[PDB]
């Protein structure tokens, strides 16, 4: 249910997010140096493709530490569909910024680092 402040990454079908994601891939635009820490969360979708149920390309959504679908998790807790990220110098402290409201626009993804070609940034 909880909405990310940012657009998701769409992962090229067949790739594995946790093999390719930089450990400091934290979207830019919200918070201070201490708060640049959180997780990407996989959110699965199915449709009919070639006349059968198919999982769509995975979309991964960023949430600050202490927010989102896994708001109670601690940094580096092993959870299927969660990949932990932090900028160097971030504080391992739960964040009070919450999540995006249902009537507010998502922000486009911008990063300090490069991303692999398997990480697609679809916009609306």
Swiss-Prot record:
Residues 93-106 have a biased composition (Polar residues). Residues 3-122 are annotated as: RNA-binding. Residues 1-122 form the CoV N NTD domain. It is found in: Virion; Host endoplasmic reticulum-Golgi intermediate compartment; Host Golgi apparatus. ADP-ribosylated. The ADP-ribosylation is retained in the virion during infection. Homooligomer. Both monomeric and oligomeric forms interact with RNA. Interacts with protein M. Interacts with NSP3; this interaction serves to tether the genome to the newly translated replicase-transcriptase complex at a very early stage of infection. Packages the positive strand viral genome RNA into a helical ribonucleocapsid (RNP) and plays a fundamental role during virion assembly through its interactions with the viral genome and membrane protein M. Plays an important role in enhancing the efficiency of subgenomic viral RNA transcription as well as viral replication. Belongs to the alphacoronavirus nucleocapsid protein family. This is Nucleoprotein. It comes from Feline coronavirus (strain FIPV WSU-79/1146) (FCoV). The lineage of its organism: Viruses, Riboviria, Orthornavirae, Pisuviricota, Pisoniviricetes.
């Amino acid at each position: 249910i909880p909405l990310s402040f940012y657009n998701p990454i769409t992962l090229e079908q067949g790739s594995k997010f946790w093999n390719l994601c930089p450990r400091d891939l934290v979207p830019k635009g919200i918070g201070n140096k201490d708060q640049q820490i959180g997780y990407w969360n996989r959110q699965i979708r199915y449709r009919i493709v070639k006349g059968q149920r198919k999982e769509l390309a995975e979309r991964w959504f960023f949430y600050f530490l202490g927010t989102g679908p896994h708001a109670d998790a601690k940094f580096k807790d092993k959870i299927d569909g969660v990949f932990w990220v932090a900028r160097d110098g971030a504080m391992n402290k739960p964040i009070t910024l919450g999540t995006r409201g249902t009537n507010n626009e998502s922000k486009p993804l911008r990063f300090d680092g490069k991303i692999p070609p398997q990480f697609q940034l679809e916009l609306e």
